[PDB]
């Protein structure tokens, strides 16, 4: 597409840590790939950015979110220390950048990963967030108000 849309080096260190913590969450659960649920688990494990405070503002603590995620996924048997992001987990990252662009932000923070998780739609993370009653627009409202 248009290379004036293509901008690299924009993920904040905290956003990169969320995505890094997701590989840890997956291997903790013994899974063979990093899915949307592990990005959500990594997001609430970080718990210090705008996404965490937006989720707190909607009455969702990390405890409640963890158990809802665990309620929808199992535990794996994978032992490979080399693990990859699922195609839909990469979709979350792509949508995170697309959301930052449309909000006019020159960075990709944890708030955009939260919105990317919701916008991805089909994965466990979107289910969990919808199951706990946070809509895309409520989440947008909360992020924009916090900024």
């Amino acid at each position: 597409i248009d290379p004036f849309t293509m901008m690299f080096g924009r993920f904040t260190e905290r956003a990169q840590k969320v995505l890094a913590l997701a590989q840890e969450e997956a291997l903790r659960l013994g899974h063979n790939n990093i899915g949307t649920e592990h990005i959500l688990l990594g997001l609430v494990r970080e718990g210090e950015g705008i996404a965490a405070k937006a989720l707190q503002a909607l009455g969702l603590g990390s405890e409640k979110i963890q158990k809802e995620v665990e309620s929808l996924i199992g535990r794996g048997q994978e032992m490979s220390q080399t693990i990859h992001y699922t195609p839909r987990a990469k979709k979350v990252i792509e949508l995170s950048m697309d959301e930052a662009r449309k909000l006019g932000h020159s960075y990709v923070g944890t708030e955009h990963i939260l919105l990317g998780l919701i916008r991805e739609g089909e994965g466990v993370a979107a289910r969990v967030l919808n199951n706990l009653g946070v809509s895309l627009n409520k989440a947008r409202q909360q992020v924009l108000q916090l900024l």
Binding site: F8, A15, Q16, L19, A20, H84
Partner: protein, 240 residues
């Protein structure tokens, strides 16, 4: 059933990386990285075992893969469309990896793709059957095992490797008093136990008690450890 091709692919090459975790994903790229553009590059689908062999090693590629991609990729070097010898994008439907052998038979240069083009690759290889190419089938202090960089950002991986570079140099100096100092900085409650110990026994305890994970304690320890070594301090300043 012809050969798949991608055009205008942005790549961020990492050279001579034996470990896939060092071929940083797009969200780890930095504005200081020198991003390049592939005018056209062939796209291959292979089974997971071959993809892992290319991604997490620097070993000889299958002869059939090389001749498949030979001179099929093009770059615009100095306002001239130029052939590349062996450059290709490879995937197993999960992982995606761009490769330029720069004339070798091994994947000397490796890159991840930007997210939009990853999704393009997934859509292009939706109905494709993997190619076998007749394929059939380590870690040390300067090349960390994946378990010891698990959960770390690109920045933390680089600072951690710097820390164990400094620890490796500390080994070659063989000064008992120095290693006792730095171990006591990490674990001050072993003062009685370590005092009959040789330099080698203490350095081993220090390595064993630091190699797992990462923390603010790690970061602060590394900042002190490297003081006085301008090469280490330069590396630290580039990352912080």
């Amino acid at each position: 059933h012809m050969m798949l091709f991608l055009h205008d692919v942005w790549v961020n090459w990492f050279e001579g990386e034996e470990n896939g975790y060092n071929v940083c994903h797009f969200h780890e790229w930095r504005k200081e990285d020198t991003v390049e553009l592939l005018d056209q590059v062939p796209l291959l689908r292979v089974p997971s075992v071959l993809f892992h062999y290319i991604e997490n090693d620097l070993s000889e590629l299958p002869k059939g893969l090389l001749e498949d991609v030979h001179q099929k990729s093009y770059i615009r070097k100095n306002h001239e469309r130029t052939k590349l010898e062996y450059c290709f994008v490879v995937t197993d439907g999960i992982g995606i990896l761009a490769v330029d052998t720069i004339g070798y038979t091994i994947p000397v240069r490796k890159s991840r793709l930007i997210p939009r083009q990853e999704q393009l690759v997934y859509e292009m290889v939706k109905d494709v059957e993997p190619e076998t190419y007749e394929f059939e089938p380590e870690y040390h202090i300067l090349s960390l095992a994946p378990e010891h960089v698990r959960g770390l950002t690109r920045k933390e991986r680089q600072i951690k490797q710097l820390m164990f570079m400094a620890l490796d140099q500390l080994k070659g100096l063989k000064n008992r008093a120095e290693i006792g100092y730095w171990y006591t900085e990490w674990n001050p409650h072993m003062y009685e136990q370590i005092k009959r110990m040789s330099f080698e026994e203490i350095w081993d305890m220090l390595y064993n008690e630091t190699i797992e994970g990462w923390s603010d304690k790690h970061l602060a320890f590394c900042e002190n450890l490297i003081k006085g070594q301008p090469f280490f301090e330069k590396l630290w300043e580039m990352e912080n």
